[PDB]
Design a protein around this ligand. Sequence first.
Ligand SMILES: *[C@@H]1O[C@H](CO[C@@H]2O[C@@H](C)[C@@H](O)[C@@H](O)[C@@H]2O)[C@@H](O[C@@H]2O[C@H](CO)[C@@H](O)[C@H](O)[C@H]2NC(C)=O)[C@H](O)[C@H]1NC(C)=O
Ligand SMILES: *[C@@H]1O[C@H](CO[C@@H]2O[C@@H](C)[C@@H](O)[C@@H](O)[C@@H]2O)[C@@H](O[C@@H]2O[C@H](CO)[C@@H](O)[C@H](O)[C@H]2NC(C)=O)[C@H](O)[C@H]1NC(C)=O
Ligand SMILES: *[C@@H]1O[C@H](CO[C@@H]2O[C@@H](C)[C@@H](O)[C@@H](O)[C@@H]2O)[C@@H](O)[C@H](O)[C@H]1NC(C)=O
Ligand SMILES: *[C@@H]1O[C@H](CO)[C@@H](O)[C@H](O)[C@H]1NC(C)=O
Ligand SMILES: *[C@@H]1O[C@H](CO)[C@@H](O)[C@H](O)[C@H]1NC(C)=O
Ligand SMILES: *[C@@H]1O[C@H](CO)[C@@H](O)[C@H](O)[C@H]1NC(C)=O
Ligand SMILES: *[C@@H]1O[C@H](CO)[C@@H](O)[C@H](O)[C@H]1NC(C)=O
Ligand SMILES: *[C@@H]1O[C@H](CO)[C@@H](O)[C@H](O)[C@H]1NC(C)=O
Ligand SMILES: *[C@@H]1O[C@H](CO)[C@@H](O)[C@H](O)[C@H]1NC(C)=O
Ligand SMILES: *[C@@H]1O[C@H](CO)[C@@H](O)[C@H](O)[C@H]1NC(C)=O
Ligand SMILES: *[C@@H]1O[C@H](CO)[C@@H](O)[C@H](O)[C@H]1NC(C)=O
Ligand SMILES: *[C@@H]1O[C@H](CO)[C@@H](O)[C@H](O)[C@H]1NC(C)=O
Ligand SMILES: [Ca+2]
Ligand SMILES: [Ca+2]
Ligand SMILES: [Ca+2]
Ligand SMILES: [Ca+2]
Ligand SMILES: [Ca+2]
Ligand SMILES: [Ca+2]
Ligand SMILES: [Ca+2]
Ligand SMILES: [Ca+2]
Ligand SMILES: [Ca+2]
Lengths: 386, 386, 386, 386
Amino acid sequence: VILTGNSSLCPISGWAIYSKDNGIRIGSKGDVFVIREPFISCSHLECRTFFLTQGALLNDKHSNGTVKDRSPYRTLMSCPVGEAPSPYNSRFESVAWSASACHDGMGWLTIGISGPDNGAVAVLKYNGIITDTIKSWRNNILRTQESECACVNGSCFTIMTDGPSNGQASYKILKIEKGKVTKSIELNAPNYHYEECSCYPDTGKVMCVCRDNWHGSNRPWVSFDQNLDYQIGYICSGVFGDNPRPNDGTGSCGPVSSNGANGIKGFSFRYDNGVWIGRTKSTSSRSGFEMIWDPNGWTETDSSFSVRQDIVAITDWSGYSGSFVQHPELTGLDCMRPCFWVELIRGQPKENTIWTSGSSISFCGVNSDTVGWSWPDGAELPFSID
Amino acid sequence: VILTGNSSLCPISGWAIYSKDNGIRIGSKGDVFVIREPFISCSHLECRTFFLTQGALLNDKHSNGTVKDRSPYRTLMSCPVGEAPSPYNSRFESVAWSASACHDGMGWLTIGISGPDNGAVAVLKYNGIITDTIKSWRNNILRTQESECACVNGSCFTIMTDGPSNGQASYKILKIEKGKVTKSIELNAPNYHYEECSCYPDTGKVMCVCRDNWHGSNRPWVSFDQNLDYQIGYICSGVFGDNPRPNDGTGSCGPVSSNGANGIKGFSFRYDNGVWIGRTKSTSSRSGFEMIWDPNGWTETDSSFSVRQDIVAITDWSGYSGSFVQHPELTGLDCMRPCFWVELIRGQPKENTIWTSGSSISFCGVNSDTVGWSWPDGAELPFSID
Amino acid sequence: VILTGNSSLCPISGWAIYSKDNGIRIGSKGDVFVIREPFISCSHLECRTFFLTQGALLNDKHSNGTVKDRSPYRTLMSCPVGEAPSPYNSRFESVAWSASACHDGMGWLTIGISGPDNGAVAVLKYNGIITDTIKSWRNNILRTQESECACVNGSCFTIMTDGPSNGQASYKILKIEKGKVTKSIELNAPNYHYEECSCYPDTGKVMCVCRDNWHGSNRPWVSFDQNLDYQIGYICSGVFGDNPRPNDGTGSCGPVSSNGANGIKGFSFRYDNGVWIGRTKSTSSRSGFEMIWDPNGWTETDSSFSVRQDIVAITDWSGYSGSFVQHPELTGLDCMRPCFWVELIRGQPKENTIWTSGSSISFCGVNSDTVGWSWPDGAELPFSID
Amino acid sequence: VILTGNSSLCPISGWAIYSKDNGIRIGSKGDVFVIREPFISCSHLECRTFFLTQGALLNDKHSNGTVKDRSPYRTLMSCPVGEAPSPYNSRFESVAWSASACHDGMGWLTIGISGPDNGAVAVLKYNGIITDTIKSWRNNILRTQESECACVNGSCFTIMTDGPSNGQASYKILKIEKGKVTKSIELNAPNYHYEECSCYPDTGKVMCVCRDNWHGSNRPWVSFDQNLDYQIGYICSGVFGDNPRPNDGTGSCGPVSSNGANGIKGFSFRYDNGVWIGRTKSTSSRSGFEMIWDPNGWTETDSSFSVRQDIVAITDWSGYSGSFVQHPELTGLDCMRPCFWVELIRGQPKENTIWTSGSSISFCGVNSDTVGWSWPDGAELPFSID
Ligand SMILES: *[C@@H]1O[C@H](CO[C@@H]2O[C@@H](C)[C@@H](O)[C@@H](O)[C@@H]2O)[C@@H](O[C@@H]2O[C@H](CO)[C@@H](O)[C@H](O)[C@H]2NC(C)=O)[C@H](O)[C@H]1NC(C)=O
Ligand SMILES: *[C@@H]1O[C@H](CO[C@@H]2O[C@@H](C)[C@@H](O)[C@@H](O)[C@@H]2O)[C@@H](O[C@@H]2O[C@H](CO)[C@@H](O)[C@H](O)[C@H]2NC(C)=O)[C@H](O)[C@H]1NC(C)=O
Ligand SMILES: *[C@@H]1O[C@H](CO[C@@H]2O[C@@H](C)[C@@H](O)[C@@H](O)[C@@H]2O)[C@@H](O)[C@H](O)[C@H]1NC(C)=O
Ligand SMILES: *[C@@H]1O[C@H](CO)[C@@H](O)[C@H](O)[C@H]1NC(C)=O
Ligand SMILES: *[C@@H]1O[C@H](CO)[C@@H](O)[C@H](O)[C@H]1NC(C)=O
Ligand SMILES: *[C@@H]1O[C@H](CO)[C@@H](O)[C@H](O)[C@H]1NC(C)=O
Ligand SMILES: *[C@@H]1O[C@H](CO)[C@@H](O)[C@H](O)[C@H]1NC(C)=O
Ligand SMILES: *[C@@H]1O[C@H](CO)[C@@H](O)[C@H](O)[C@H]1NC(C)=O
Ligand SMILES: *[C@@H]1O[C@H](CO)[C@@H](O)[C@H](O)[C@H]1NC(C)=O
Ligand SMILES: *[C@@H]1O[C@H](CO)[C@@H](O)[C@H](O)[C@H]1NC(C)=O
Ligand SMILES: *[C@@H]1O[C@H](CO)[C@@H](O)[C@H](O)[C@H]1NC(C)=O
Ligand SMILES: *[C@@H]1O[C@H](CO)[C@@H](O)[C@H](O)[C@H]1NC(C)=O
Ligand SMILES: [Ca+2]
Ligand SMILES: [Ca+2]
Ligand SMILES: [Ca+2]
Ligand SMILES: [Ca+2]
Ligand SMILES: [Ca+2]
Ligand SMILES: [Ca+2]
Ligand SMILES: [Ca+2]
Ligand SMILES: [Ca+2]
Ligand SMILES: [Ca+2]
């Protein structure tokens, strides 16, 4: 089957909890990878958690976090959703310190970037066979989504960035068919900054909501059709989505400069003029998580919103978050179902350990009754290795 | 295939041992979840053990019992019958501190309740995809069976409770089709109390035998057809089924008030006016287990019975128990086979440990020779974490 | 696919090594069951190692030997051939302190005996579903092969013993179809003793070579056709097959009384008037292993033989051994291939540990070049738990 | 599916990283085999890592390297590519201290050599069933490739050696069909030395590049067609391929005598008159790894070359390396894709441990952009067992 991707996002009123892996609690005794960015991606048959590991287990000396993030040991692996990421249940995908994956209905596409900062190379695999490579074109840390790419009608789409993370860089949309790049376009986006995009298919097109690490505390977006004809902007809501960020106030259709430097991987779902925003509860640290429905937040700059659903209390650590979808071929629904995952980061720099890892929770949007709560990581730090 | 569920319970004379997982003995060294309620549920192809875990392993500090039962860490998992429940052999099912699951012949239905005490939400999944939610309607600990639901002719049925565990609460029957609630009915049951129901199909209808936590030391039951027309009662036998309970004597068709408060999840199988009762051997603690055949015990209040089969000796810990069936589509028989599982609880509050866990045994009803014995947990407590 | 079982044993000249699991060496660190009798059985698709475990892991306190052999914790498990038997790679089969298993071409039959000594019950499963039970008929430790049963033309056959292990007992052949006992016969075998039979199919019939624990240091045998017409005798060769045994000398077609009490599970393959004998190298302890070809040893009493192939040196521990076959439906050959497994027992009573376990090696008969060697267990005892 | 093997090697410009297993880093805490020679072999559906283990885990006393290399404990296993080789994810293949494996499109062939030095026996398996044996014909350590065999048109091909490793030995090509040897030829190769061959299919023929342990610091080669008509030579490039070796200088069509004794398993790919050479960076120790393209290096003796791609830095340990291919039936390409693996050896003799093991990296040849880097093992030695 080919995922057609022609349906629209399902109407939803809230988010129902889908998974929680308790990876760090389990890794206190079991053999569990130290991981980051545990993104979920689904096929027409199953959902999988992808993640990056340094090839080290929790509570082992090799978890010592003084290793660089872009190291030669870092690999992309995947395990079933909701399971602790272990060498005994994880499939190897690619050598990678930056990554993406998605399924077009016939096979898994994985994208793994490795190599040195001045000449990194993305290796594209389709069903685990190398099908293409993309080399850094600006020689300054080629990097990609750290969540699932989006597939429409037999083609898959991703965003890659090359250049500074504290200034103007270069952004490319890629169209990939059976793992071969068939088209690429560099965005003409002066004064924009795109990193770590969350992209989802919707009505035959793709929407990506990303991270401005240069000078925006609201999130940039880019949407495009199957030929990579594109539009760009920033989410206008004064419910600002990045972290760090200022207190909610008047937004902008351009980058909001106050507290704009630095950031966090996040996501949002557009519903016409409205937007569902996932964000941390703290404005200054990666703490808490909440879903906010702003019925005019895509296009209007006020800070008013209609619904807030709690996900993680502000007293608990959160982390990266990303979108994923479940297509009709998987669900049997007539619409595209939006979902998201949250990474719950424990360890350095906020806690007195030698290591850093995340566990994950995930939710799916439903048009039935839901409830806010807090589903935090739950591990008791420090560990015995510390 | 659709499980028709139109056949009657097989004639049986005793219980043959089906599985034993040795989970706690193995968890002394291996990586084994701390678990509760390991109920079994079967498809037309296989049987699985479902269980709730806090995401903690035996002999690890996170197994510390001080965590509340309704925590955000609690998840429903499943593994093959008879295997130690490990993070390396277990499937994730749902985030849940109360749960149910069953198979209709075409897919697994799982029901997992999480969220706060005043607004819990049951997430319904079919083949692992969220298909519906049910929110608390009394705002007082929505909770369900902790054993398998019952499927007949393409619909699956379960019982949910909301309200006090020491007084009158509210009880609903649900009819579920492919994970969607298609009908629900509130029982009109003043002075009844229903919790932790064990439900099985029989001749196109469902029978549930439950736990009266309020004021009954015999077990209440409810049976209903596919339109949710229902009957309610209490098992009349003077062989009382709950724990705690009084000494055997004259029973009642209503709740037996002596020692009626508190209780334990249990089960029974009705055969016309007779009943097979599974119960602890002790009247005051969760110790021992036995199967009693009382040929007039469903409807008559005397305490005489015909057959007793030992399952666990009175000197050994037992725990929760539940029914499961094997349908003709799985066994090739022309009747519905009754089976049951027993949880063997070790640790708190009876033993000097920081943790509480169960292991499991299970038995199938057969019309051939059987024997009583004792198949206890067998772990040597305390563990080194203690 | 039904295994016809109508072919004869392949002509062979020696034994080629098939598998070695290194179970005890691996279990010094990994999570590995303490096991006994690791017998192999094959289907038309795969070969599996079955084994009995006490539900305890090597190097853990629950491996403490003081538990009796016939305990309620003992279970039959299986894993792929050549893998260390772990809770993470093993399938649960049955609760059992004595067992057998085989595949008829369409499904696995397992036989598991549990319960008390005076009333044990064999539980029969077909495809993991209970299909029959057999209760002790002499109330004195019902017991069976501890190796694979034999299947011919849709029926499987096994031997069960009930009664004394130091005197005359009672022996039954069972005919089983889809897990249901369809016929049984009690052997008329005064002065014979049958235990722990190794049975293989050959030309539409079954041949079993067993253990005389009463008063024979040669091995008894029983052969029968699909109607359970049977013949009985003892292997005549002065190359005595049991352990303990006298030095090789003049054999007997009846039980050889010298060193006759006690014994060890073993096997032999009949080729007309000749026999392949597997035995320990020591006459007094379970040390070493060798295959001997005696071209007239089935029917003649001399102690001369033609070929000896070393398997385990006399300076290394051996243990139980049993036959298995690979049918033409598995191999594509036009004959029945004979194979055997050997258990290498470490620990009590010969070594200063708290535990006893076995690892396994296996060999297949081939008509090409082979070599003798020693393939011992290789663990360094004692372990840290000792 | 029969792999035709009639295509030629794909044109390539560099090497893209395919896998990294981090086995030793993970095995610091996880249950991971001590391994050597982790060679990769692919079917039409998947790629697997084969390896030899002594049946011991990292960080356990049985990893003590005083056990000889040709021991009875040594076994050939396989696991998915990129996963740490563990007893929980590895399938058993054969008892072997020297081994080879490949897939003909319909099934796995494995060759495992065991037994004594003066009479070793290769056991050939097809789909895990013993199909043939080959006994030592010179009684002096029969040994084979330690990498994948080459399959063309329903036949698989391998090289075996018997005789001295410091003098003239005897070399045989084998043609194997469904695991049965159908033809063999002894090379007429006076003054040549062939060990540990890396063989690949190319245009209906097989090319093997090997290790001269006697007196060559360049590598010998043998190529042959499906009838085992063959040609022999040595790689002429003054870019010497063995380790140890002299500094780059004038090559030879025969064995280069300077530093010729001893060696390391390696590989090369012929492209007309040019050659891609994989070699260590150090001339004196097993350190570093690089790929060199020499456009006239197959047939000319100068030390000039065109392209160097770094794989492992000279300050990090490397080890054995070998070729593998991905056939068009797996990739969908119209050519034969060349790939290679590198073993990263840690421990004795270079480091102060009791053990020796390898982890692995692998690369595939592509005609797109690539980059040099260093992907070393990354474990911190010594371990706590030391
Ligand atoms: C078994 O179920 C069938 C299936 O029909 C159900 O009808 C829906 C209302 C809903 O309950 C779904 O689960 C099913 O699809 C029953 O057949 C139907 O019965 C109704 C009324 O009796 C009739 O109007 C329909 O036409 C029937 N449909 C079909 C396809 O036959 C059937 O009654 C059930 N059998 C028993 C013994 O209860
Ligand atoms: C590819 O193989 C076919 C088949 O050859 C047979 O099968 C092989 C597995 C092996 O057993 C060979 O020895 C067999 O001959 C070859 O086709 C055969 O060619 C011969 C003449 O050379 C002819 O007599 C047969 O009839 C052919 N058989 C079939 C089924 O076509 C073919 O030549 C091989 N191709 C190459 C390039 O060598
Ligand atoms: C082989 O089996 C055939 C099938 O019939 C059998 O019938 C009953 C009695 C059982 O024994 C059951 O296992 C089988 O289904 C026979 O017709 C045939 O005679 C048997 N013997 C042969 C072919 O030699
Ligand atoms: C998508 O396209 C298919 C035809 O290819 C059509 O049947 C279906 O209704 C379309 N869905 C939407 C939501 O447009
Ligand atoms: C962690 O790494 C740093 C840098 O290599 C090292 O200096 C430090 O001592 C390490 N700490 C531990 C606990 O391993
Ligand atoms: C989908 O792809 C197919 C072939 O790749 C093409 O016919 C069509 O233009 C695309 N668009 C839609 C809406 O199907
Ligand atoms: C159930 O339905 C099947 C098929 O209609 C029938 O063969 C079977 O006998 C029925 N059983 C009962 C008890 O109605
Ligand atoms: C268990 O939890 C209690 C709760 O405060 C804590 O005080 C105690 O130290 C814990 N014990 C262990 C062994 O972790
Ligand atoms: C066994 O039966 C099969 C089925 O027809 C036949 O092909 C084969 O030759 C028979 N073998 C013997 C030894 O009778
Ligand atoms: C083993 O079991 C016996 C049984 O009583 C016990 O007395 C002994 O202390 C145990 N030994 C160890 C080392 O656990
Ligand atoms: C290999 O043989 C097949 C036979 O059908 C042919 O189609 C294919 O093109 C051939 N390839 C080459 C490279 O000769
Ligand atoms: C390793 O093996 C040798 C061989 O007997 C032994 O002498 C030595 O003490 C062992 N060392 C360790 C650390 O186990
Ligand atoms: Ca920002
Ligand atoms: Ca607004
Ligand atoms: Ca009660
Ligand atoms: Ca009664
Ligand atoms: Ca461990
Ligand atoms: Ca004897
Ligand atoms: Ca003789
Ligand atoms: Ca050399
Ligand atoms: Ca040159």
